[PDB]
Write a protein that binds this ligand. Structure first.
Ligand SMILES: Nc1ncnc2c1ncn2[C@@H]1O[C@H](COP(=O)(O)OP(=O)(O)NP(=O)(O)O)[C@@H](O)[C@H]1O
Ligand SMILES: [Mg+2]
Length: 307
């Protein structure tokens, strides 16, 4: 009651007996599996991150600080376009349990499905990511690591921002350079407007079907490139309407860049007439079960319907 509000998010501790790992997804080693809350007659698809046991105690506390910090953030947020933490489990190694995003990160998704992503998907993704960031801004959260790789894909129609390792309250105090606002690189300044810049880069990643920003350019130069007024080039499928919104996100005066709530409005306008704003050959002809090896999927509930 001296300024900020108490964070009353619930931190759920889960038992190992309650979830079954099914398959490895990555290596912090991440499994796909199912979580069956005791006595609830539901099966919830989950990602289970089992932390690396770590050799050096300095590496140990680095792993653990990322883990507890992003457990704290994901437990405190609740929005259809941000990833929710379902719980943690304090076995010998700590495990973080999140809602399963079956289709992986969005960068790999647009890379692998270039020839079947239509303009309606692209623009709807832009709207959903801006809704997620607008929610974070409503909660005074600055993400500092927004990128296509940090957007996950529940369905082709539904994505969610993730990876809150670098997040912080707006006013508070204490490295992907090609996604960083200029004032982030020069003065270590981070705001919701620097997130807006990163959002511009992410949209450019999407519109280019996963190209690398400033490909082959060494990070040491990016700062001088940007002070000289250079920016990422207009993607081939982008009308000037879309590209111009993106370019506005990269203006040097952070207060001149658009706001996330403006970006929601503008991309929603454009998603009302997708083919007037992105030009994709064969657009009109583009389309997109037991994910586990379990034969009894009848009681499966998505985390979003259990909550
Ligand atoms: N809930 C989830 N559902 C499905 N896949 C996931 C989920 N969470 C993470 N992954 C993937 O599993 C791997 C673990 O990623 P992560 O633990 O976030 O490490 P990271 O280095 O921070 N990756 P990033 O957030 O993209 O910067 C990545 O390939 C993710 O895309
Ligand atoms: Mg992280």
């Amino acid at each position: 009651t001296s300024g900020e509000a108490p964070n009353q998010a619930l931190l759920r501790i889960l038992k190992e007996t309650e979830f079954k790992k099914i398959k490895v997804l990555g290596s912090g080693t991440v499994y796909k599996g199912l979580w069956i809350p005791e006595g609830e007659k539901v099966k919830i698809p989950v990602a289970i991150k089992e932390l690396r046991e770590a050799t050096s105690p300095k590496a140990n506390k680095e792993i653990l600080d990322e883990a507890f910090q992003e457990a704290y953030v994901m437990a405190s947020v609740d929005n259809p376009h941000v990833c929710r933490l379902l719980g943690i489990c304090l076995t010998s190694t700590v495990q973080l349990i999140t809602q399963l995003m079956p289709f992986g990160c969005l960068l790999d998704y647009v890379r692998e499905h270039k020839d079947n992503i239509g303009s309606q998907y692209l623009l709807n993704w832009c709207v959903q990511i801006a809704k997620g960031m607008n929610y974070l801004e409503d909660r005074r959260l600055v993400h500092r690591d927004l990128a296509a790789r940090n957007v996950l894909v529940k369905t082709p129609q539904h994505v969610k921002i993730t990876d809150f390792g670098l997040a912080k309250l707006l006013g508070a105090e204490e490295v992907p350079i090609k996604w960083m606002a200029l004032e982030s690189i020069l003065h270590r300044i981070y705001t919701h407007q620097s997130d807006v810049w990163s959002y511009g880069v992410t949209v450019w990643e999407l519109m280019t079907f996963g190209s690398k920003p400033y490909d082959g350019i060494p990070a040491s130069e990016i700062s001088s490139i940007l002070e000289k007024g250079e920016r990422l080039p207009q993607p081939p499928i982008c009308t000037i309407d879309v590209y111009m919104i993106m370019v506005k996100c990269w203006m040097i005066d952070a207060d001149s860049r658009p706001k996330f709530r403006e970006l929601i409005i503008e991309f929603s306008k454009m998603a009302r007439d997708p083919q007037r704003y992105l030009v994709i050959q064969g657009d009109e002809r583009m389309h997109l079960r037991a994910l586990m090896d379990e034969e009894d999927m009848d009681d499966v509930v998505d985390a979003d319907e259990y909550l």
